[PDB]
């Protein structure tokens, strides 16, 4: 269901508000080895462990955007988009990932052509420096963001950002240092469903030698050190009175399981372990109190000089919202003990509350339940607790299932009203939040293109534009994308 | 300052401002007023010892060997309450004056169960409901000298005697008293007795400046507190089957300072929460749900004992009414977890400081005279709303509230000024009015007790402070005179 008068109209938001779509470098690029591109960490994972991909697939082609960016810009423009959020392949720019491994010239040419073409068509680029693709070269030289020396990674990351600032600084006016560090670290060294795939012994991931209790924090700590270092560099030599830098946090809105004041407390620790873990540091200069008290020693401290670079190290914040959960309290005692870094929030995240019903109508996959109301909740917390800063909904959408046993007909795939409904609703929620005081300034539909979904392989289509992989990645606009064209063009 | 800015005439609390069933009274402490520490073979309490062997720990070196010698003037005491039209009267029973050994083997003091016996009937013969406090910091030196008192490691050598000093009370008294209070201000007791050691016996960690610097400021306060909690459920359960009655009620008295964030930051809001926890929740949460509050279990960790499920049962819901002792409030400023900070007292586990001055330099409220009471009636409302909205909105009795006029050797307080306590009158009228606003807001408060119906001994403060609404002439025959406050209260109840 949906509704006539309740349908978001472009003239519901200010003119300067921005609307666009987003994608990930590894998910759409392909050309995994074309033109001297280095081996990313995911290239390795997929190739050597196809048994960690729901369908054993990989992104050696993706949506072949590396060769078809011309059309990607073409869709966007006929869709009348205001901006395009894409990410840059660290391996494609720095094959060895280091300054001295050399700067691959082809990769620079690509992002220049894409950026220029996006600009000639009046589309603003919102670039994500790092979107999970860590050069495999660094992965073996000192264990990527798992570097316990805190320096190699920070310097190797900082130099990468500098190269980006140097070759795309005049055209790119909006930067994002990292994309969802909470996940990346949690999924790469906690559950281990992400590359490299480490985890505590006994658990089931590719390299069960890791430590789901101490690794996520180590990698996440470096990330924050790299952000502060890159942003320091940005503010000192590249920042213009009209350019911005920041980062995107993954986030699900938490809600009390029952009614006990205990579940409200769980909710708080939940928002903390999820959003605050990385937000609090870039805002005040240190992690959430809760975490320092529940993960005690397993969470490094920061030198005063670091606490200083991190605080206020942003002009805008990116929010990636999909669903929400119920947070039920879990008391401290001898009967319980944390398995994952995430179990430190001494709270469980349910989908179904005490009434047995789902926190929202299922959207098709194993985790997306529609609850746009949690979106407003998050927008009010940013507003009332963390200074109501410029927020951009950098990701939002759903993923239609399309597998071997239950392939999804192209005619049906193209008629995504479950998605069209989902988008309209969240976009309407931004009109409610704005009226409620939020400082949101834009929305990005997740996956302008159908593409690789990490461990989910090609079983899900998140795009608003259909990609025929068994053709020549030919593209066909979905109903959602067509509404978005009417929304922007009207 | 000296001048009192009082409430506008129209703003002055009237009696018909509250329901006919609300109750108004005054309160006192056994050791503080009784005196007669030994008369009639009464066992030595822990404070008798402290004061006698350590008069250096008393600001004026005195003790309460006589106090307000109420032991012989209970008739006069009740007569004042009658005149003032008081509805109830809170008081405590002296442990060593029922069992100079706190145990069966030690027996009982005939004249002990006599004193309190007459006291009650007399009170009941004037329409004055009695609210008795089972334990009020007075421990029989018997137990303290035996197994350290409430520092019992076993968790029963002391849970036995108490459950016995208690049970035996319900025997000779639980027949007239319709409202009981197991303990009074456990937090203060523990933290002051085995943390900063200002309270008998005076145990604080090495390096610290107390009488016996060999204790552990970070653990003892947590064990003594642990014991008191068990001793409570034990007793209460006993009273819930051997002395229970439909028109009776039972609970405990919690001391509590209001908490308000120091600054605008959300970090200070968080500090405030841990502060309400280390103070009120430490003991409240246990009797409400069965276990201490999350924050403490995370900040104090191992130092905070656990409970057996057959204990997490006898504590959960062990009360029909709760007692609140409110005096002042504080600003809670966040203090982060880091290599540069480590706890020294059991109270430092709140990772928060309790300021009196705000970031604007000014006091959270006007100083009332002594070293710690700042008038902030709003804090009382905040508390009542938490009891309401978070802890079930149970029956609350403001069991203590008042101020202490300073009276020392170097700065004697003339009886004339002592008798005109407009600073105290204003403090009471303001807190009483705050209850009227709390009642309209939904709070389930049902009574108010003025702290110290009598001028008396003030623990480590000795006789330097007069908290009474009735002046006591110790340099006479403890002759009593009503202060201006007590006179208004008589008009408030009588009008």
């Amino acid at each position: 269901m949906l509704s006539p008068s309740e349908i978001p109209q472009r003239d519901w938001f200010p003119s300067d508000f921005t609307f666009g779509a987003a994608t990930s470098a590894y998910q759409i690029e392909g050309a995994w080895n074309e033109d001297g591109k280095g081996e990313s960490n995911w290239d390795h994972f997929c190739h050597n462990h196809p048994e960690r991909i729901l369908d054993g697939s990989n992104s050696d082609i993706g949506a072949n955007s590396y060769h078809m960016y011309k059309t990607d810009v073409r869709l966007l423009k006929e869709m009348g988009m205001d901006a395009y959020r894409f990410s840059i392949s660290w391996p494609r720019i720095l094959p060895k990932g280091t300054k001295e491994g050399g700067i691959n010239p082809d990769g620079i040419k690509y992002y220049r052509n894409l950026i220029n073409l996006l600009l000639e068509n009046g589309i603003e680029p919102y670039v994500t420096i790092f979107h999970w693709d860590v050069p495999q070269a660094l992965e073996e030289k000192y264990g990527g963001f798992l570097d316990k020396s805190h320096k190699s990674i920070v310097e190797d990351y900082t130099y990468f950002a500098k190269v980006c600032f140097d070759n795309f600084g005049d055209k790119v006016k909006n930067w994002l240092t990292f994309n969802e560090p909470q996940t990346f670290t949690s999924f790469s060294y906690g559950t281990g469903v992400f590359a490299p795939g480490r985890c505590s012994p006994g658990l089931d991931c590719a390299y069960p030698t890791g430590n789901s209790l101490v690794e996520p924090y180590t990698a996440g700590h470096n990330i924050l050190l790299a952000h502060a270092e890159a942003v320091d560099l940005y503010n000192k030599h590249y920042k213009r009175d009209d350019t911005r830098i920041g980062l995107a946090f993954d986030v699900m809105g938490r809600v009390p399981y029952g009614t006990s004041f205990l579940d409200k407390q769980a909710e708080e620790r939940s928002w903390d372990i999820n959003l605050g873990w990385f937000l609090e540091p870039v805002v005040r200069g240190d992690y959430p109190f809760s975490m320092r008290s529940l993960a005690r020693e397993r969470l490094p401290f920061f030198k005063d000089e670091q606490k200083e670079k991190l605080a206020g190290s942003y002009n805008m914040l990116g929010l990636n919202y999909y669903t929400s959960r119920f947070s039920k309290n879990i008391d401290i005692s001898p009967n319980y003990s944390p398995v994952l870094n995430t179990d430190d929030a001494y709270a469980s995240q349910e989908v179904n509350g005490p009434d047995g019903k789902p926190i929202g109508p299922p959207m098709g996959n194993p985790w997306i339940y529609m609850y746009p109301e949690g979106l407003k909740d998050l927008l009010m917390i940013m507003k009332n607790k963390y200074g109501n800063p410029p927020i951009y909904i950098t990701e939002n959408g759903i993923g239609d299932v399309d597998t071997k046993e239950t392939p999804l007909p192209m005619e049906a795939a193209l008629n995504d009203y479950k998605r069209l409904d989902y988008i309209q609703r969240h976009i309407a929620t931004l009109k409610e939040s704005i009226d409620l005081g939020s400082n949101v300034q834009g929305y990005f539909a997740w996956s302008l293109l159908d593409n690789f979904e990490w461990f989910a392989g090609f079983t899900e289509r998140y795009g608003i534009v259909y990609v025929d992989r068994n053709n020549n990645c030919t593209r066909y606009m979905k109903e959602s994308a067509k509404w978005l064209k009417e929304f922007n063009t009207a």
Side-chain angles (χ1 to χ4, degrees), chain A:
Chain A
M1 325 294 109
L2 28 149
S3 194
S5 56
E6 306 185 306
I7 296 294
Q9 293 295 73
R10 184 63 190 68
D11 55 50
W12 268 25
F13 313 76
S15 66
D16 51 291
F17 198 86
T18 81
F19 286 106
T23 50
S24 166
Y26 182 64
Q27 309 187 200
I28 70 173
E29 261 170 50
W32 85 284
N33 57 36
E34 300 196 11
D35 308 311
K37 168 178 158 302
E39 184 197 5
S40 57
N41 55 168
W42 275 82
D43 275 331
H44 201 173
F45 197 67
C46 290
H47 297 163
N48 293 51
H49 296 291
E51 76 293 314
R52 303 303 188 177
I53 303 300
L54 194 62
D55 59 330
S57 58
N58 63 62
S59 210
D60 285 25
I61 302 188
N64 201 200
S65 296
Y66 181 71
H67 290 288
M68 282 173 275
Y69 71 97
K70 285 218 192 72
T71 67
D72 279 12
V73 186
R74 186 184 291 140
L75 288 333
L76 302 173
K77 178 68 167 182
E78 279 127 6
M79 280 185 84
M81 287 305 207
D82 292 321
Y84 180 38
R85 172 186 168 206
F86 66 95
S87 101
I88 300 174
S89 180
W90 185 336
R92 191 185 296 287
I93 297 309
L94 297 168
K96 294 293 178 57
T98 60
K99 166 198 196 64
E100 56 106 39
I103 296 181
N104 167 46
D106 289 314
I108 286 290
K109 181 195 60 176
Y110 174 57
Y111 297 113
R112 189 67 192 177
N113 294 316
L114 156 54
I115 290 163
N116 278 310
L117 191 62
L118 264 174
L119 287 176
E120 292 184 312
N121 298 64
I123 309 181
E124 266 299 313
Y126 274 52
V127 189
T128 292
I129 301 183
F130 171 80
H131 201 145
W132 301 346
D133 44 352
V134 183
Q136 185 61 61
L138 307 172
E139 203 77 50
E140 289 120 24
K141 199 262 212 59
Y142 58 64
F145 276 95
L146 288 175
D147 169 8
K148 322 141 166 314
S149 68
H150 307 303
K151 173 191 151 62
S152 287
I153 183 66
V154 184
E155 297 185 302
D156 288 345
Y157 174 77
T158 293
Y159 176 77
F160 165 44
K162 176 171 177 289
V163 165
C164 286
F165 298 160
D166 277 339
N167 289 77
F168 320 119
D170 51 323
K171 302 294 166 58
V172 175
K173 299 189 205 294
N174 291 275
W175 302 89
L176 287 175
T177 61
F178 293 82
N179 170 79
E180 297 180 78
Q182 192 284 140
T183 289
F184 180 74
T185 73
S186 276
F187 282 13
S188 299
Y189 315 111
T191 41
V193 230
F194 269 8
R198 295 162 69 72
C199 62
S200 307
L203 300 178
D204 197 51
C205 69
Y207 292 65
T209 304
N211 185 330
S212 299
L213 241 57
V214 186
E215 273 170 345
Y217 293 115
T218 313
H221 191 77
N222 287 316
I223 294 160
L224 297 179
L225 282 181
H227 166 78
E229 209 65 20
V231 172
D232 193 62
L233 172 81
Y234 193 64
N235 289 168
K236 292 183 180 181
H237 307 299
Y238 305 99
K239 177 85 161 43
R240 271 30 154 175
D241 298 1
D242 67 342
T243 73
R244 294 173 300 186
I245 189 174
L247 74 174
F249 300 126
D250 48 73
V251 59
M252 291 189 291
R254 312 298 168 174
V255 170
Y257 184 57
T259 44
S260 170
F261 64 78
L262 292 178
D263 287 347
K264 190 63 183 176
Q265 292 180 161
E267 178 206 59
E268 291 313 1
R269 299 190 291 284
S270 299
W271 286 106
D272 273 15
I273 196 66
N274 185 192
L275 180 62
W277 182 6
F278 295 102
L279 173 62
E280 210 141 309
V282 304
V283 179
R284 91 193 185 72
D286 207 356
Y287 307 106
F289 189 105
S290 63
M291 296 174 64
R292 262 206 189 301
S293 68
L294 286 166
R296 310 293 301 192
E297 83 278 16
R298 309 193 275 77
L299 189 82
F301 291 79
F302 288 110
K303 306 182 69 185
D304 284 288
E305 34 197 48
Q306 302 178 308
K307 267 181 166 51
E308 254 282 314
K309 295 167 183 168
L310 282 185
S313 51
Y314 63 84
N315 305 124
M316 65 187 156
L317 270 21
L319 257 31
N320 286 358
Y321 185 74
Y322 289 94
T323 177
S324 298
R325 295 271 175 282
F326 288 108
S327 308
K328 185 177 187 301
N329 178 73
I330 290 183
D331 292 306
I332 291 177
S333 69
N335 298 301
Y336 189 76
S337 171
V339 169
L340 305 192
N341 54 298
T342 51
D343 296 332
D344 283 304
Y346 275 74
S348 61
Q349 321 304 311
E350 312 300 19
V351 163
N352 304 309
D355 88 322
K357 297 183 176 186
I359 191 173
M363 282 291 110
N365 54 65
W367 66 282
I368 299 186
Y369 293 84
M370 183 168 83
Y371 189 59
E373 295 106 282
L375 204 198
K376 165 142 62 193
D377 286 26
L378 171 73
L379 282 174
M380 287 293 107
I381 282 173
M382 289 312 298
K383 156 181 165 50
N384 301 313
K385 175 183 182 181
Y386 301 120
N388 195 36
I391 292 294
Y392 279 92
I393 299 299
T394 42
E395 280 193 20
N396 184 235
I398 72 171
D400 298 348
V401 188
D402 167 54
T403 66
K404 305 195 53 165
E405 300 75 9
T406 311
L408 201 203
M410 163 192 193
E411 171 145 64
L414 297 186
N415 291 307
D416 52 338
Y417 292 94
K418 199 174 205 176
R419 160 175 294 113
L420 177 52
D421 178 58
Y422 181 106
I423 290 177
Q424 295 175 301
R425 290 186 180 293
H426 286 81
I427 292 186
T429 298
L430 299 194
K431 165 56 181 184
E432 299 181 303
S433 286
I434 283 172
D435 287 339
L436 270 179
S438 180
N439 189 41
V440 225
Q441 283 164 31
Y443 170 84
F444 290 72
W446 174 236
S447 255
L448 164 272
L449 305 172
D450 271 338
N451 63 209
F452 189 71
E453 293 290 336
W454 317 102
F455 70 93
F458 290 108
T459 65
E460 296 179 57
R461 292 181 183 277
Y462 274 81
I464 53 177
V465 165
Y466 195 71
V467 175
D468 193 352
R469 281 187 265 80
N470 286 147
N471 177 84
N472 277 315
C473 286
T474 291
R475 306 163 163 59
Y476 307 86
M477 294 198 281
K478 304 191 182 199
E479 284 312 306
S480 59
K482 293 178 183 178
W483 176 73
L484 290 163
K485 175 178 178 177
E486 179 205 320
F487 182 81
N488 282 168
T489 306

